[PDB]
Amino acid sequence: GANKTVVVTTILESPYVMMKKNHEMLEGNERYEGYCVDLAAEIAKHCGFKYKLTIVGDGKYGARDADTKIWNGMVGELVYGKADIAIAPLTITLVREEVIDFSKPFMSLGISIMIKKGTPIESAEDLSKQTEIAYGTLDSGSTKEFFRRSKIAVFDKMWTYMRSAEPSVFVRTTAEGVARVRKSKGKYAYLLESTMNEYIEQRKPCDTMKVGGNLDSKGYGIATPKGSSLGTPVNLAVLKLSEQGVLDKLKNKWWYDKGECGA
Amino acid sequence: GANKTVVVTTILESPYVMMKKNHEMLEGNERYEGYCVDLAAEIAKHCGFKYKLTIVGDGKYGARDADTKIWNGMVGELVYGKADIAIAPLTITLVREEVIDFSKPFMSLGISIMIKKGTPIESAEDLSKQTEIAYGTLDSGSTKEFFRRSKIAVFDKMWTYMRSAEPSVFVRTTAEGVARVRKSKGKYAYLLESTMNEYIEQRKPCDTMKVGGNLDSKGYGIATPKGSSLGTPVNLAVLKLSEQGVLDKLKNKWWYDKGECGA
Numbered sequence: 001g002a003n004k005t006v007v008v009t010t011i012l013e014s015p016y017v018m019m020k021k022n023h024e025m026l027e028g029n030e031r032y033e034g035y036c037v038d039l040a041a042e043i044a045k046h047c048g049f050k051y052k053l054t055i056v057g058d059g060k061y062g063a064r065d066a067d068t069k070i071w072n073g074m075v076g077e078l079v080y081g082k083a084d085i086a087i088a089p090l091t092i093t094l095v096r097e098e099v100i101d102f103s104k105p106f107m108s109l110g111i112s113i114m115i116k117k118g119t120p121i122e123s124a125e126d127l128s129k130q131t132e133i134a135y136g137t138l139d140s141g142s143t144k145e146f147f148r149r150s151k152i153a154v155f156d157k158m159w160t161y162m163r164s165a166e167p168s169v170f171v172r173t174t175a176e177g178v179a180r181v182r183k184s185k186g187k188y189a190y191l192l193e194s195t196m197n198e199y200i201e202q203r204k205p206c207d208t209m210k211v212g213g214n215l216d217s218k219g220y221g222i223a224t225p226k227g228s229s230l231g232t233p234v235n236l237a238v239l240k241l242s243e244q245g246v247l248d249k250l251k252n253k254w255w256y257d258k259g260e261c262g263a
Numbered sequence: 264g265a266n267k268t269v270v271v272t273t274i275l276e277s278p279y280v281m282m283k284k285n286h287e288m289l290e291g292n293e294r295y296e297g298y299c300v301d302l303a304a305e306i307a308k309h310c311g312f313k314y315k316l317t318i319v320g321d322g323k324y325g326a327r328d329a330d331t332k333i334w335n336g337m338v339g340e341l342v343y344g345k346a347d348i349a350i351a352p353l354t355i356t357l358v359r360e361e362v363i364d365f366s367k368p369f370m371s372l373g374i375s376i377m378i379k380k381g382t383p384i385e386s387a388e389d390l391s392k393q394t395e396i397a398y399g400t401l402d403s404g405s406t407k408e409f410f411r412r413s414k415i416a417v418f419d420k421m422w423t424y425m426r427s428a429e430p431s432v433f434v435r436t437t438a439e440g441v442a443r444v445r446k447s448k449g450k451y452a453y454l455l456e457s458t459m460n461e462y463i464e465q466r467k468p469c470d471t472m473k474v475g476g477n478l479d480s481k482g483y484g485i486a487t488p489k490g491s492s493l494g495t496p497v498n499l500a501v502l503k504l505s506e507q508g509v510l511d512k513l514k515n516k517w518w519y520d521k522g523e524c525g526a
């Protein structure tokens with residue numbers, strides 16, 4: 001019956017969703033800026049809904065605990081009825097597609113390698129054949145799972161190393177992985193999605209680089225709880241925004257117009 | 264009730280589906296080879312179905328006639344109940360998504376420019392600012408529609424020219440667009456999807472090139488008639504094949520392992 005305010009789950013991840021410098025001065029949706037802030041606004045406009053942005057409580061993307069089988073992160077928020085829609089850099093994966101609905105992708109990505117500039121690494125193959133430079137991934141998302149599940153020898157070799165490396169190569173947020181790259185003197189490499197990698201490469205201090213090709217190819221989709229009547233209009237909206245070049249415009253705005261490291 | 268042989272519609276388009284050299288010697292599905300032949304086999308295996316490959320009668324992707332409102336091509340074949348599934352380089356678009364179901368993409372692409380080697384053209388912007396080199400697109404697919412619908416000035420300028428150009432810049436098949444590039448002495452440029460462009464670039468006589476960036480970003484999806492119970496298992500199969508690197512393997516097989524123009 002009565003339309004209600006749509007509860008949007010998302011995550012603080014640059015440049016998708018960030019607190020404005022002056023957020024303490026602001027209320028509600030106006031506290032945040034970014035690619036997914038703009039995208040939420042476009043989708044809401046095209047679908048005729050009022051919405052509230054909320055940051056996922058546990059600060060995670062979404063993984064199911066192997067013992068409890070409880071979903072955390074934004075996925076768990078959709079699954080347990082805490083949010084109506086996730087509008088974030090949330091990777092489309094088989095295990096997630098089984099439990100939530102995903103629009104067609106609104107952005108493509110692959111897993112990629114971030115280095116401190118001058119690091120003697122060009123590929124995953126380079127990483128796997130050496131021990132001097134540590135490397136790891138984010139917890140509780142699609143990248144860690146990629147390695148954990150991979151039957152490809154190079155990626156199996158990598159996973160075998162990372163899962164038992166000491167101290168831990170895994171980080172809780174993208175910002176911590178980036179900080180580790182910068183602070184580790186070339187002795188840590190970070191495995192993260194190319195979208196995130198390419199953003200950070202254009203931010204001061206301009207000391208990191210994306211090296212080599214992407215290890216996989218895939219995309220982010222807008223997720224809804226399974227069978228939600230939001231799914232259909234939201235998917236049509238993503239296709240429309242795609243076809244109008246709105247998605248390209250937003251990407252240019254937040255990646256390259258914001259570039260700090262040159263033209 | 265009783266499972267039946269799934270009727271697959273597809274299109275003869277290199278290197279997705281081609282007649283084997285010795286096809287007259289062969290029967291059924293064995294007449295054809297290609298990326299979508301292999302993909303049909305993987306999907307069928309993962310979904311537990313028997314299938315028949317058939318080439319779309321009219322040799323078109325799919326467009327709705329503005330007066331009759333009748334769909335042609337593979338789309339029309341799904342819509343009118345002539346085929347159960349399309350497994351082809353069929354672009355996910357808003358207008359098609361409204362009338363058929365699409366899996367998540369199994370391959371990404373954008374619109375791109377093919378030139379005869381040495382043609383003084385580097386971008387769509389170059390094409391739009393000149394009259395010496397003609398350019399056009401395929402009929403009855405997503406590329407023509409991109410230009411017809413675009414509010415972006417460069418692409419509106421292009422569309423204005425192409426729709427009234429004499430003789431016609433439009434072609435009935437990819438092979439005819441390619442032949443026109445090769446046979447036109449640098450005086451014709453072809454707008455086609457990057458996947459197709461990149462394949463042809465690696466085929467003898469090795470006289471064409473992809474120039475500049477892609478004009479858009481999108482993907483091919485496996486299409487089913489709207490509400491078909493095939494859609495769910497097929498989508499899960501595409502994600503699984505993606506995540507196993509089967510899609511990457513097939514792309515390498517048909518594009519680059521088949522390369523004729525060097526390493």
Ligand SMILES: CN(C)CCNC(=O)c1c(NC(=O)Cn2nc(C(F)(F)F)c3c2CCCC3)sc2c1CCCC2
Nearest residue numbers: 092104105106217218219355370371481482505510511
């Ligand atoms: C193994 N590889 C060869 C296959 C790669 N595979 C893909 O192309 C692919 C994706 N490709 C894209 O998202 C590219 N894309 N597609 C669209 C669409 F709407 F038309 F579908 C859009 C984009 C990016 C921009 C927005 C609109 S997402 C995704 C996959 C594999 C399964 C996991 C999720």
Ligand SMILES: N[C@@H](CCC(=O)O)C(=O)O
Nearest residue numbers: 061089090091141142143
């Ligand atoms: N986009 C990823 C998070 C980042 C990563 O795993 O690298 C996900 O949805 O899990």
Ligand SMILES: N[C@@H](CCC(=O)O)C(=O)O
Nearest residue numbers: 324352353354404405406
């Ligand atoms: N993949 C396109 C056909 C080729 C093109 O338009 O360039 C479609 O599904 O319509």
